Structures are given as C-alpha cells and as structure tokens.
Amino acid sequence: MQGHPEVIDYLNTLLTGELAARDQYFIHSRMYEDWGFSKLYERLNHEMEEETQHADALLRRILLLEGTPRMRPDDIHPGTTVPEMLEADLKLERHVRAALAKGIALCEQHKDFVSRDILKAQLADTEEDHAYWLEQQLGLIARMGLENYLQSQI
Amino acid sequence: MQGHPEVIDYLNTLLTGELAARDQYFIHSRMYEDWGFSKLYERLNHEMEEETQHADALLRRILLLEGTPRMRPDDIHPGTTVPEMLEADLKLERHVRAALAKGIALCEQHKDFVSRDILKAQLADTEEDHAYWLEQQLGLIARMGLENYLQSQI
Amino acid sequence: MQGHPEVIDYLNTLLTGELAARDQYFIHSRMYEDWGFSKLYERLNHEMEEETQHADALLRRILLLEGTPRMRPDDIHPGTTVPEMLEADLKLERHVRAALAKGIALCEQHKDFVSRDILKAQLADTEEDHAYWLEQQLGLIARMGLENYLQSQI
Amino acid sequence: MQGHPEVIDYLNTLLTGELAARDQYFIHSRMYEDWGFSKLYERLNHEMEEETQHADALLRRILLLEGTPRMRPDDIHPGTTVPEMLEADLKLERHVRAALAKGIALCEQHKDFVSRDILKAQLADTEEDHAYWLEQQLGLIARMGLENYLQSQI
Amino acid sequence: MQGHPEVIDYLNTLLTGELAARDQYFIHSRMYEDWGFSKLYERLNHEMEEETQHADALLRRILLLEGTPRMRPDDIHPGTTVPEMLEADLKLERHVRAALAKGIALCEQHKDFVSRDILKAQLADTEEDHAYWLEQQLGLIARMGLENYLQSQI
Amino acid sequence: MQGHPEVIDYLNTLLTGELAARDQYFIHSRMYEDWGFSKLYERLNHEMEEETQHADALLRRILLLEGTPRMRPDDIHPGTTVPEMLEADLKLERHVRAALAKGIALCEQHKDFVSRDILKAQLADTEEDHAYWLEQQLGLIARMGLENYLQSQI
Amino acid sequence: MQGHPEVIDYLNTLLTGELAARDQYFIHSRMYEDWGFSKLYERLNHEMEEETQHADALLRRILLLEGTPRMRPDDIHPGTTVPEMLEADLKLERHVRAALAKGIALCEQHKDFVSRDILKAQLADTEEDHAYWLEQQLGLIARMGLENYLQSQI
Ligand code: NA
Ligand code: NA
Ligand code: NA
Ligand code: NA
Ligand code: NA
Ligand code: NA
Ligand code: NA
Ligand code: NA
Ligand code: NA
Ligand code: NA
Ligand code: NA
Ligand code: NA
Ligand code: NA
Ligand code: NA
Ligand code: NA
Ligand code: NA
Ligand code: NA
C-alpha cells in the first residue's frame, strides 16, 4: 500500500532520530559501566534496546508503506559526567516527545491511523518510562546530593 | 590504562565500520522480510545482532584504554534486489576483513596484544561465518538460478 | 590364529580400498558443504563414517589372523561438480562391490567363513545403501533437472 | 620437549611474580575482612584464586618444557588503608601487565607460540578484570568520597 | 576469499601430515587392542579421532580459501613393539610440532591471522596433550620397567 | 583485642612455615603430574589446599590479635625423584610438628587458649594425616620395591 | 560426680555473667529495633540466643557436678545511643573473655578437663564472633562516620 509521501517522510525523520537515540544510550550505558555504575549501565542498556525496537517499528512501517528508510542516524551529543549524561538524555527524550506529538497530528490529518497508533505507543514509552525516569534521577541528585546518588548506582 | 593513541584511533575506525555494518544488515533483513523471504530475514537479523556485539566489544575496549568512542556510523550502501543486497553485504564484509587484518598488524606493532586478540576473534567471524555464507548464496544463485534460489528462501 | 596368506593379502587389498573410499567421501562431503549443499554434506559425511567402520572391521580381522595391515590408501579421484562427484562415488562403490564379491568367493574357497561373513555384511551395505542412493540421486537429476535437484539439497 | 632457555627463564620470572601477587591478595583480602568490608574481601579472595590459577599455568608450562620452576615469591608491598591497598594492587597489576607484554614479544621471537598464548590469556585477565576493577574503585572514591565508598563495601 | 598461495600450499602440507598421523594412530590403537592393552587402545583411538578433527579443520580452511585439498596421506611408520610404537608416535608428534610452528610463522608473514589461529590451536593440542602423554609413557617405562608398565595398560 | 607479642611473633613464624609448605606441595604435586603419577598429584594437591587453609587460619588469627602478618614464605627444599620428594615432605612435616608443639606450650604459658586450640587442630592434621601418609608411602616402597610402588601411583 | 568446689563456684560466677550478658543483648537488640536499625536488632538478637546457649551449657555442667546453680544475673549496663551500646557490649565481652581465660587456668589446675573444654568453646565464641564483630562496628563508625554507619544498619 503506498503511504502518503508527507507521512513517509516524517516517519523517516523519526527513524533517524531513534537510530541516534539508540546510539546515544549505547555509548552512555557503556560509559556508566566503565566508571562502575552498574545500575545506570543496566537502565541505559535497556533503553538502548527499547530504542532499537522503536526504530524497528518505524523502519518496518516505512517499508510496508512502500517507502525507502533513511538509515543515517542523527548526530548524538553524549555528556562527560553523570549529571551531563542524564541531562543530555532528558533533552533528547524531550525532543523525541515533541517530534512524536507533531507526527501524531500529521498522521491524523492525512488519515493514516495505523501510523498514528504506532507513534502513540512510542510517545507513551517516551513520556512515562525513559523521560520520567531521567527526571527522577535528576531530582534524586537534587534531594540527596550527587555523591549519595552515585553511591546508590554502584 | 592509557592505550596507544594510534591503536585507539584505529579501533575507532573499526567501530564506525561495525556500527554501519549493523545498520546495513538492519535494513537488508527488514527488506527481505518485506518481500516474504523469511530465511534471508532470519540470517541477516542474526548478522545484525553479531555486528552489534562486534561494535560493543570495540566500544568497551576503547573506553577501557581511556579513549573516546566515535559513534557516527560510516555510510551504508544498501542494494535494491536480492542479488544486489548479497553482493553489497559481501563487499562490506571484504572491506571489514581487510580493515581487521590491518588492525591486527598494527596492534602487534604497538604491543597491544589484547586488542589484537579482540580483532582476531572478529576476523574469524567475518571470514568463516558471514562472508563465507554470502559467497555460498551467490554461488547457489549461479548453480540453480535466481528463481529457484528465491523459492528456497521463503 | 594364522589366516591363509591369500586371504590376508586380499583383505589388505580391500583395506586400502576402504581407506581410500573414506577419504574420497571426506573431501566430497566438505566440498558439498563449501557450496552450501547441507543435505549432500550430511549424507557423504555419514558414508565417510561407514567407510571408517568398514576399514576398521578389515584391519581388525587382518590383525586377528596375524597379518600386517597395509595402511596406504589407494588413490582417490574426486569430481569437480555435483554430477561428477556423484558419478565418481558411484564408480568407486561399483569397484568396491566387484572387489568384495571376488573376496567372498576367495574366502569360501579357502574355507575362511568368518572373513566371508565380514565381507558379505560390507557387500550388502555397498549395494543397498551407498551405491543405491547414488543411483537414485543421478536418477533424480535426470527426472527433474540439475537445478531443481540442487535446490532440494540445500 | 626442551623449551628455549630464554623463554623458560622468563616464564620463571613471571611465576615468582604471580606467586607474589597471589600472596598480596591473600593478605589484602583478609585485612579487608578484618575491618568488616565483606565486598572487598570477596573480590580480593577471588583475585587470589585467579592468581593461583595463573601461577599454576606457568608452573605446569615450565615443567612441560623440562625447566625447573622457581618457587620463591617476589617481595610483596601491602598497603595499610583501603586507598593504599587499592593503589598497591593496581601498581602490582600494572607491573604484571608490562611483564606479560614483554614476555609475549619474547615468545613470538623464539617461536614458542603456545607459551605466547598462555601469557596472552593472563594478559587479558590482568587488563580487563583485576586492573580495570581497581581503577574503577579508585574512581568511585574520587566521585563519591571515601566514606560513601567504604559504606558501599560493607 | 582467495587465500595466499604459499599459505594454501603449506596448509596442504600439514593436511597430508594429519591424514597420516590419523592412520598411524588407527593402526597402533588396533595393534594395542590385538595384544590386550585396552588402556593403550583407548588413548590412541582417542588420538586418531583428534587427528581426524585436525585434518578436518585444515581441509575446511583450504576450501574456504578456494584451494584444492591434497588428500594423499604422508607415509606412516608403525612400530612393532609397545616401546617402538610409543617412540614412533612421539617422533611423529615432534615432526608435526615443528611443522605447525613453521606454519604459524608463515601465516603471520602473509597476514593470514585466522589460519594462524587454527594452527596455534593444533599446536597446543600437539604439545600439551599427545606428545606430552607419549613422553610420560616412555618415562614410566624407564622408572618402573617395561613389564610393570605393560601390566598397568591391560 | 591485642594479643601477647610473643604469641603473635610465634604465630608469624608458623605462618611463614605454612606458606612455604603450601608451595613445596604445589611444586611436588605438579612434578608428580609431569611424570604421570596421578595418584601422587592428587594427594599432594589436596595437601597444598590443606596448607593454604592452615596458613589462612593463622593469618586471620594474627589480624584478629591486631598483629601484622609476615607473608614471606620460608625457603622450600623440593626433591628430584619420588623417594626424595616423599622424604623432603616428611622432613618438612616433622619440622612443622615440632614447631606446632612448641607453639602450643607457649600459648598455654601466655594464657592464649584460643590460639592454642587453633594450633592443636593443625597439629592433629600434621601427625595423623600428611606425615602419617608419607611414612606409609616410604614404608610401601620398602615392602614392595620402588618399581611396584610407582606402578601403583599411576 | 562431685566436682571440685572451687571449680563449681567459678562456673557459677561465669553463669551469672552469661545470664546478664543474655539480658543486656535482649534489651539492646530491642532498642535497636525500636529505632529502626533492623540489622543491629538481628545481630544482637542472635547474640542473646548464643548467650542463652552459653548459660545453658554452664548450668547443665554445674548440675552434672552436683552443684547448685546461681540464677541471679549480674547487673547489666545498657547504653543510650548506638555508639554507647556497641561500646558497652564490647566492654562486657572483654570482661567475659578475661573471666573465661581465668576459669580455663583454674580448671586445668584442678584437673577438670571437661569443664575446661566447655569454657574454651565459649572463649573462642567470645573472641572470634561477638567481640570481634563489635570491634568491627566501632571501626566502621570511625572510618565512614556515624551517619553513614547508621544508614547501613537500617
Ligand atoms: Na523512542
Ligand atoms: Na526512548
Ligand atoms: Na563485524
Ligand atoms: Na560481520
Ligand atoms: Na565400504
Ligand atoms: Na561404501
Ligand atoms: Na523448484
Ligand atoms: Na596474574
Ligand atoms: Na591478577
Ligand atoms: Na594433529
Ligand atoms: Na596429534
Ligand atoms: Na606389579
Ligand atoms: Na600445616
Ligand atoms: Na601439612
Ligand atoms: Na558468652
Ligand atoms: Na557473648
Ligand atoms: Na551514604
């Protein structure tokens, strides 16, 4: 089935974003492990896997709609300390949140309701799982101090 | 432990190559699935997972050596038909083979024997698993014809 | 127990033949695997194992009869394509068939009935298992065409 | 098989080093236990066992090569506080790393490839397991403070 | 992938050597059984199987490198008494050891690191398993006498 | 609890003795294995483990008493033949026996009854297990001859 | 059997001491629980049970020796904060240690070796289990601070 060209283009924009998010969580999880923060490695490794699944869902939808997926990831922006890394991932998730919301509106406009539903599922993951968790970590640092927070993530 | 700068740089060159190979097998496996060739999807999906493990091993080694991983994948070059896709993946694996062999020689020269061993393991995977399998598929097409070959991959 | 010298000599002739057949099926099975014909690899690998057992039975009988086994295999004649390999193995099995039948007659003449029985067991394997299967494969190529046959052996 | 005298001598130098490392981790693990840091006792007790296995591999190789093992351990240099003990073990592992790398080069030069492979296995353990872990602990102290770090090791 | 002609030729030299070693242990194991030394039969039968695996690894590597395997075994040199058989197998294993070491150096020179690794694995088997065991048996004969040694191998 | 300085010093003397005994049984067990005497390897490997436990008990007691353990092993004196090795280990165990008995008397004198009990446990192991077994082996050699004895230890 | 009156009297002195120690650990364990330090409650509750077993062993021995047990516990001296409670229990265990050592000497003098052995078992518990653990806790407070220590005992 040929999808609407505007929708296929927008899905491709989301795809390169998710390929990049996957890779930013790849490098951050391994950086966390390099420093001995096993709990932070485990969570970001999980979020890398979630992003790979998000990317896969978009890629498959684009092919189903007879489009050609764009596989070049967007640039990533890794941090250099734990607070910078949390903040950088939260900034990225806020960007993805806004991009997904715009995409849901566009899919509704072009009457592509299945693509809309794919994006809504990813939007709920973005808001309720990764972004919320990042906000929580930054809030814990603010409440107990960075040193106590880091101790808790060994 | 601070690694030798030339070795760290070369590992980074291999890393961006493996991130790209992962993504080329991501798109090819899903293209194969889009056309209904389940056996080709299954093999390339497996090879995508293997490439992710190769990339992970290099990334972790670079961090251990106190280097900074380069996460921008090299460009990929997907094909548009099954023969083109097999040929494109074989070309990529031949490139990776040559790059790994050069890296093993460089690691020996700089007396980084653990990095050498990591690359040798990936070299054996490259020669004996993916590249050999691709050569076999292209040889089967040549022996039984493309139509019979495609039938066998449903 | 000292065996009859003519019988021991003839068993040695069969032994060098079976050592050679083992090795011809060793190289053919791995050639089949090299090309991606897993079903042909599996059958010839099995027939290599059967030949090793045939050789072992003859070797042990020669020692029991106080003879000295000849361990130099006869020359082998591998093919270069699937039809040539099937034909070459069928030619070899026809040669072994004739040699075993001659040996059974010789054992009867010299009243070595246990050696006769060992050869009869190998003769039945030769006629009813490997040679018959090879004839069947060549007949399938003739009935469905080489390309369809090769497809079936992946 | 008589080994090359230079290689046997060098393996003996490594052996007395590993016997000493075993004993330095013996005393440090029990010191950690004496102070109530169970997690540090457990890790160093494990590393003592690993060193015993390293020493055993070298000793057996020297005997196989018809050499006579030197069983006098090198001197050890235990610390008196947790940071000093971590630093002392990291210094020792860095020394062993350099000694193994030199030994691998020497084995290659004298074409003793099996001894080279034994040393490479120990080199990978040294770099990727104990030395890396020690670097991580010292980095955790630097990131969260010594008091928080010690709390985490109870 | 086309291998380096010098490496393929050398692998073929090793292959005919391993096919011969397989057959020398075939005849010796059965000779040991013929005399009632079950423990010597069991060990040499195992070493025959190991040699078959060594030969298989070389054969498959030669095919992968697009070479043509040479399947004519080298001549064998069986002994006529238990001490002669042990000595003959030890001489053969020392020859294989030297040939493998030369091959590892040649593979390094031609930058064929996977072939090098295949040979190193076989080299370790040769030095640490069969050759060492043969040296041990000859040493036991020297320490307890041949008659006591033979009794122990029933 | 601060131990009596004379008792702590004496425990340290026993500790360096047990570290040495551990290492003498390490080298002897592997020498026995090198010659193919599996039963002698197994027993001395066990006695090496027992000595490690003896050393550990002393080391921990010294730390508990707020002393500083001495980790330099005494010199060892390995033999070069099976009878010399048995005799050398029996001489060492007789030395340890005398040293432990002296230590038990000293602990009683200084009213350190728990240290006394630790030494009594080791004394019983020394007399009733290793030393007695060594005496038995030397007696078996004397009763059946060295060649028969060695045969029994394969 | 009538015990020596001096020994029976001394065992009674130890009995009233152990009845008191039981009760001091009864009140401290429940105080720790009252404040929410579950780990400190669990350890002191265990030590209360151990003291009950110590008291039981002495009581039964006194009856066996036809003596009359004294069941009035000595006075206890509970602390009012965690550091005071640890210190008070360590002072009590040091007192019990000295009393047991004196009792062992007295039992030896009066040739009551079974009573001596009962006291030695309790002495080892006192030195190696409770007193050592208390010393460790006070040392942890000194190394990480009281606030971190208390956090670890929730
Ligand atoms: Na996402
Ligand atoms: Na996400
Ligand atoms: Na790869
Ligand atoms: Na690959
Ligand atoms: Na046959
Ligand atoms: Na056959
Ligand atoms: Na067909
Ligand atoms: Na080591
Ligand atoms: Na180590
Ligand atoms: Na071999
Ligand atoms: Na071999
Ligand atoms: Na005997
Ligand atoms: Na001992
Ligand atoms: Na002992
Ligand atoms: Na008590
Ligand atoms: Na107590
Ligand atoms: Na804390």
PDB file of C-alpha atoms in Angstrom, chain F:
ATOM      1  CA  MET F   1      41.963  -7.481  71.157  1.00  0.00           C
ATOM      2  CA  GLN F   2      45.727  -7.068  71.400  1.00  0.00           C
ATOM      3  CA  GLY F   3      47.426 -10.442  71.563  1.00  0.00           C
ATOM      4  CA  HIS F   4      50.582 -11.170  73.532  1.00  0.00           C
ATOM      5  CA  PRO F   5      53.564 -10.024  71.450  1.00  0.00           C
ATOM      6  CA  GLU F   6      55.421 -13.318  71.948  1.00  0.00           C
ATOM      7  CA  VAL F   7      52.406 -15.291  70.775  1.00  0.00           C
ATOM      8  CA  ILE F   8      51.847 -13.050  67.752  1.00  0.00           C
ATOM      9  CA  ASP F   9      55.516 -13.364  66.826  1.00  0.00           C
ATOM     10  CA  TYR F  10      55.386 -17.160  67.141  1.00  0.00           C
ATOM     11  CA  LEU F  11      52.179 -17.377  65.063  1.00  0.00           C
ATOM     12  CA  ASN F  12      54.007 -15.390  62.381  1.00  0.00           C
ATOM     13  CA  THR F  13      56.843 -17.925  62.465  1.00  0.00           C
ATOM     14  CA  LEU F  14      54.281 -20.687  61.928  1.00  0.00           C
ATOM     15  CA  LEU F  15      52.588 -18.679  59.145  1.00  0.00           C
ATOM     16  CA  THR F  16      55.759 -18.334  57.040  1.00  0.00           C
ATOM     17  CA  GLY F  17      56.301 -22.076  57.566  1.00  0.00           C
ATOM     18  CA  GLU F  18      52.803 -22.941  56.305  1.00  0.00           C
ATOM     19  CA  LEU F  19      53.096 -20.602  53.291  1.00  0.00           C
ATOM     20  CA  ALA F  20      56.289 -22.498  52.428  1.00  0.00           C
ATOM     21  CA  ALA F  21      54.747 -25.952  52.980  1.00  0.00           C
ATOM     22  CA  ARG F  22      51.838 -24.925  50.671  1.00  0.00           C
ATOM     23  CA  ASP F  23      54.383 -24.046  47.971  1.00  0.00           C
ATOM     24  CA  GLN F  24      56.503 -27.159  48.411  1.00  0.00           C
ATOM     25  CA  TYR F  25      53.366 -29.280  47.900  1.00  0.00           C
ATOM     26  CA  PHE F  26      52.406 -27.044  44.913  1.00  0.00           C
ATOM     27  CA  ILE F  27      55.668 -27.853  43.131  1.00  0.00           C
ATOM     28  CA  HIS F  28      55.784 -31.542  44.175  1.00  0.00           C
ATOM     29  CA  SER F  29      52.171 -32.233  43.127  1.00  0.00           C
ATOM     30  CA  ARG F  30      52.819 -30.760  39.670  1.00  0.00           C
ATOM     31  CA  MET F  31      56.129 -32.637  39.347  1.00  0.00           C
ATOM     32  CA  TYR F  32      54.268 -35.866  40.120  1.00  0.00           C
ATOM     33  CA  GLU F  33      51.743 -34.983  37.409  1.00  0.00           C
ATOM     34  CA  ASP F  34      54.571 -34.138  34.967  1.00  0.00           C
ATOM     35  CA  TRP F  35      55.820 -37.742  35.377  1.00  0.00           C
ATOM     36  CA  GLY F  36      52.363 -39.319  35.065  1.00  0.00           C
ATOM     37  CA  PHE F  37      51.794 -40.283  38.739  1.00  0.00           C
ATOM     38  CA  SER F  38      48.182 -39.071  39.001  1.00  0.00           C
ATOM     39  CA  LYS F  39      47.568 -40.533  42.462  1.00  0.00           C
ATOM     40  CA  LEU F  40      50.585 -38.663  43.913  1.00  0.00           C
ATOM     41  CA  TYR F  41      49.497 -35.446  42.182  1.00  0.00           C
ATOM     42  CA  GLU F  42      46.023 -35.811  43.665  1.00  0.00           C
ATOM     43  CA  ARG F  43      47.251 -36.339  47.234  1.00  0.00           C
ATOM     44  CA  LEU F  44      49.829 -33.534  47.204  1.00  0.00           C
ATOM     45  CA  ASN F  45      47.381 -31.160  45.525  1.00  0.00           C
ATOM     46  CA  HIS F  46      44.994 -31.913  48.403  1.00  0.00           C
ATOM     47  CA  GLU F  47      47.794 -31.312  50.947  1.00  0.00           C
ATOM     48  CA  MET F  48      48.630 -27.976  49.254  1.00  0.00           C
ATOM     49  CA  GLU F  49      44.966 -26.975  49.758  1.00  0.00           C
ATOM     50  CA  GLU F  50      45.129 -28.092  53.413  1.00  0.00           C
ATOM     51  CA  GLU F  51      48.252 -25.989  53.939  1.00  0.00           C
ATOM     52  CA  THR F  52      46.529 -22.974  52.390  1.00  0.00           C
ATOM     53  CA  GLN F  53      43.733 -23.452  54.933  1.00  0.00           C
ATOM     54  CA  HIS F  54      46.307 -23.771  57.772  1.00  0.00           C
ATOM     55  CA  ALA F  55      48.024 -20.553  56.633  1.00  0.00           C
ATOM     56  CA  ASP F  56      44.647 -18.794  56.360  1.00  0.00           C
ATOM     57  CA  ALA F  57      43.702 -19.770  59.937  1.00  0.00           C
ATOM     58  CA  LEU F  58      47.000 -18.365  61.275  1.00  0.00           C
ATOM     59  CA  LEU F  59      46.843 -15.195  59.193  1.00  0.00           C
ATOM     60  CA  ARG F  60      43.300 -14.457  60.351  1.00  0.00           C
ATOM     61  CA  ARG F  61      44.192 -15.097  63.996  1.00  0.00           C
ATOM     62  CA  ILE F  62      47.193 -12.739  63.780  1.00  0.00           C
ATOM     63  CA  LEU F  63      44.971  -9.968  62.343  1.00  0.00           C
ATOM     64  CA  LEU F  64      42.311 -10.607  64.990  1.00  0.00           C
ATOM     65  CA  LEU F  65      45.044 -10.178  67.653  1.00  0.00           C
ATOM     66  CA  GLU F  66      45.973  -6.853  65.959  1.00  0.00           C
ATOM     67  CA  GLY F  67      49.289  -8.175  64.695  1.00  0.00           C
ATOM     68  CA  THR F  68      50.765  -7.756  61.233  1.00  0.00           C
ATOM     69  CA  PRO F  69      51.159 -10.996  59.267  1.00  0.00           C
ATOM     70  CA  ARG F  70      54.518 -11.874  57.778  1.00  0.00           C
ATOM     71  CA  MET F  71      53.849 -13.100  54.235  1.00  0.00           C
ATOM     72  CA  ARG F  72      57.358 -14.092  53.081  1.00  0.00           C
ATOM     73  CA  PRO F  73      57.368 -17.897  52.857  1.00  0.00           C
ATOM     74  CA  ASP F  74      60.291 -19.812  54.356  1.00  0.00           C
ATOM     75  CA  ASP F  75      62.633 -21.405  51.804  1.00  0.00           C
ATOM     76  CA  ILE F  76      61.462 -24.702  50.347  1.00  0.00           C
ATOM     77  CA  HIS F  77      63.553 -27.785  49.533  1.00  0.00           C
ATOM     78  CA  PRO F  78      61.976 -29.824  46.745  1.00  0.00           C
ATOM     79  CA  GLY F  79      63.304 -33.307  45.893  1.00  0.00           C
ATOM     80  CA  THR F  80      64.245 -34.553  42.427  1.00  0.00           C
ATOM     81  CA  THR F  81      62.892 -38.127  42.490  1.00  0.00           C
ATOM     82  CA  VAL F  82      59.802 -39.671  44.089  1.00  0.00           C
ATOM     83  CA  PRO F  83      61.680 -41.048  47.125  1.00  0.00           C
ATOM     84  CA  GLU F  84      63.479 -37.723  47.658  1.00  0.00           C
ATOM     85  CA  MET F  85      60.194 -35.827  47.387  1.00  0.00           C
ATOM     86  CA  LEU F  86      58.418 -38.062  49.903  1.00  0.00           C
ATOM     87  CA  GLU F  87      61.388 -37.767  52.279  1.00  0.00           C
ATOM     88  CA  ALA F  88      61.576 -33.989  51.851  1.00  0.00           C
ATOM     89  CA  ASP F  89      57.865 -33.582  52.617  1.00  0.00           C
ATOM     90  CA  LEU F  90      58.150 -35.880  55.652  1.00  0.00           C
ATOM     91  CA  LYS F  91      61.126 -33.836  56.935  1.00  0.00           C
ATOM     92  CA  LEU F  92      59.079 -30.679  56.474  1.00  0.00           C
ATOM     93  CA  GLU F  93      56.032 -32.128  58.259  1.00  0.00           C
ATOM     94  CA  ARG F  94      58.282 -33.289  61.167  1.00  0.00           C
ATOM     95  CA  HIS F  95      59.628 -29.746  61.413  1.00  0.00           C
ATOM     96  CA  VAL F  96      56.083 -28.300  61.430  1.00  0.00           C
ATOM     97  CA  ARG F  97      55.056 -30.881  64.056  1.00  0.00           C
ATOM     98  CA  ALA F  98      57.851 -29.767  66.403  1.00  0.00           C
ATOM     99  CA  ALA F  99      57.110 -26.091  65.766  1.00  0.00           C
ATOM    100  CA  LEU F 100      53.419 -26.513  66.499  1.00  0.00           C
ATOM    101  CA  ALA F 101      54.076 -28.437  69.707  1.00  0.00           C
ATOM    102  CA  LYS F 102      56.387 -25.635  70.873  1.00  0.00           C
ATOM    103  CA  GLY F 103      53.742 -23.086  69.965  1.00  0.00           C
ATOM    104  CA  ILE F 104      51.014 -24.901  71.915  1.00  0.00           C
ATOM    105  CA  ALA F 105      53.214 -24.825  75.023  1.00  0.00           C
ATOM    106  CA  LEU F 106      53.893 -21.110  74.513  1.00  0.00           C
ATOM    107  CA  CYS F 107      50.205 -20.304  74.069  1.00  0.00           C
ATOM    108  CA  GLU F 108      49.368 -22.154  77.300  1.00  0.00           C
ATOM    109  CA  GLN F 109      52.102 -20.211  79.136  1.00  0.00           C
ATOM    110  CA  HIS F 110      50.679 -16.861  77.932  1.00  0.00           C
ATOM    111  CA  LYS F 111      47.087 -17.973  78.545  1.00  0.00           C
ATOM    112  CA  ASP F 112      46.043 -17.643  74.918  1.00  0.00           C
ATOM    113  CA  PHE F 113      43.799 -20.690  74.819  1.00  0.00           C
ATOM    114  CA  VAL F 114      42.063 -19.976  71.522  1.00  0.00           C
ATOM    115  CA  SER F 115      45.385 -19.693  69.698  1.00  0.00           C
ATOM    116  CA  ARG F 116      46.423 -22.930  71.417  1.00  0.00           C
ATOM    117  CA  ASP F 117      43.305 -24.651  70.082  1.00  0.00           C
ATOM    118  CA  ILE F 118      43.979 -23.446  66.518  1.00  0.00           C
ATOM    119  CA  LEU F 119      47.464 -24.947  66.705  1.00  0.00           C
ATOM    120  CA  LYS F 120      46.225 -28.199  68.214  1.00  0.00           C
ATOM    121  CA  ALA F 121      43.859 -28.691  65.277  1.00  0.00           C
ATOM    122  CA  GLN F 122      46.740 -28.180  62.855  1.00  0.00           C
ATOM    123  CA  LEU F 123      48.949 -30.476  64.923  1.00  0.00           C
ATOM    124  CA  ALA F 124      46.447 -33.301  64.667  1.00  0.00           C
ATOM    125  CA  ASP F 125      46.249 -32.784  60.891  1.00  0.00           C
ATOM    126  CA  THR F 126      50.023 -32.828  60.672  1.00  0.00           C
ATOM    127  CA  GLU F 127      50.502 -36.045  62.700  1.00  0.00           C
ATOM    128  CA  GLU F 128      47.521 -38.090  61.667  1.00  0.00           C
ATOM    129  CA  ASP F 129      47.033 -37.108  58.004  1.00  0.00           C
ATOM    130  CA  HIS F 130      50.026 -35.866  55.967  1.00  0.00           C
ATOM    131  CA  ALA F 131      53.024 -37.068  57.996  1.00  0.00           C
ATOM    132  CA  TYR F 132      51.463 -40.495  58.603  1.00  0.00           C
ATOM    133  CA  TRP F 133      50.608 -40.894  54.920  1.00  0.00           C
ATOM    134  CA  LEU F 134      54.182 -40.000  53.906  1.00  0.00           C
ATOM    135  CA  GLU F 135      55.555 -42.552  56.377  1.00  0.00           C
ATOM    136  CA  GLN F 136      53.182 -45.092  54.858  1.00  0.00           C
ATOM    137  CA  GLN F 137      54.392 -44.394  51.300  1.00  0.00           C
ATOM    138  CA  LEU F 138      58.024 -44.745  52.265  1.00  0.00           C
ATOM    139  CA  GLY F 139      57.140 -47.993  54.057  1.00  0.00           C
ATOM    140  CA  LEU F 140      55.354 -49.316  50.957  1.00  0.00           C
ATOM    141  CA  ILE F 141      58.432 -48.623  48.836  1.00  0.00           C
ATOM    142  CA  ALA F 142      60.456 -50.549  51.414  1.00  0.00           C
ATOM    143  CA  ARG F 143      57.992 -53.510  51.383  1.00  0.00           C
ATOM    144  CA  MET F 144      57.206 -53.948  47.671  1.00  0.00           C
ATOM    145  CA  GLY F 145      60.068 -52.138  45.947  1.00  0.00           C
ATOM    146  CA  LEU F 146      60.144 -48.746  44.270  1.00  0.00           C
ATOM    147  CA  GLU F 147      59.110 -50.023  40.826  1.00  0.00           C
ATOM    148  CA  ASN F 148      55.936 -51.722  42.136  1.00  0.00           C
ATOM    149  CA  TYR F 149      55.175 -48.690  44.272  1.00  0.00           C
ATOM    150  CA  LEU F 150      55.473 -46.311  41.293  1.00  0.00           C
ATOM    151  CA  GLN F 151      53.222 -48.564  39.224  1.00  0.00           C
ATOM    152  CA  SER F 152      50.564 -48.278  41.924  1.00  0.00           C
ATOM    153  CA  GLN F 153      50.622 -44.457  41.749  1.00  0.00           C
ATOM    154  CA  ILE F 154      49.891 -44.077  38.035  1.00  0.00           C
TER     155      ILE F 154
END
